[PDB]
């Protein structure tokens, strides 16, 4: 179901992040689960441009870092 949150081809990364975590909240994801989801699913469910940027940034990036790198495209 969080598996169904994929980023739109032109959706700003930031709006994709609200839906992702919004969906995680509804399912009462624990804090530990949000941390693992941030580094995995949030990345793989991003659009091809953000996906490439996030993979390039690498594991253990913070959300803020993820967002700075994906402002624009």
Q: Give residues in contact with its own copies (CB under 8 A).
A: 1-3, 29-30, 32-33, 36-37, 39-41, 43-45, 55, 59
- Of 13 and 43, nearer to its own copies (C-beta) is 43
By CB atoms closer than 10 A (0-12, 13-18, 19+), residue 62 is: exposed
Q: At what angle do helices 63-70 and 13-26 cross, to 10 degrees?
A: 150
Q: Least distance in Å: CB of 40 to its own copies?
A: 5
Q: Least distance in Å: CB of 3 to its own copies?
A: 5
């Amino acid at each position: 179901s969080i598996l169904d949150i994929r980023q739109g081809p032109k959706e700003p990364f930031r709006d994709y992040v609200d839906r992702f975590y919004k969906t995680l909240r509804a399912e009462q994801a624990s804090q530990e689960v949000k941390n693992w989801m941030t580094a995995t699913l949030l990345v793989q469910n991003a659009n091809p441009d953000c996906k490439t940027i996030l993979k390039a940034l690498g594991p253990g990036a913070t959300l803020e870092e993820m967002m700075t790198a994906c402002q624009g495209v």
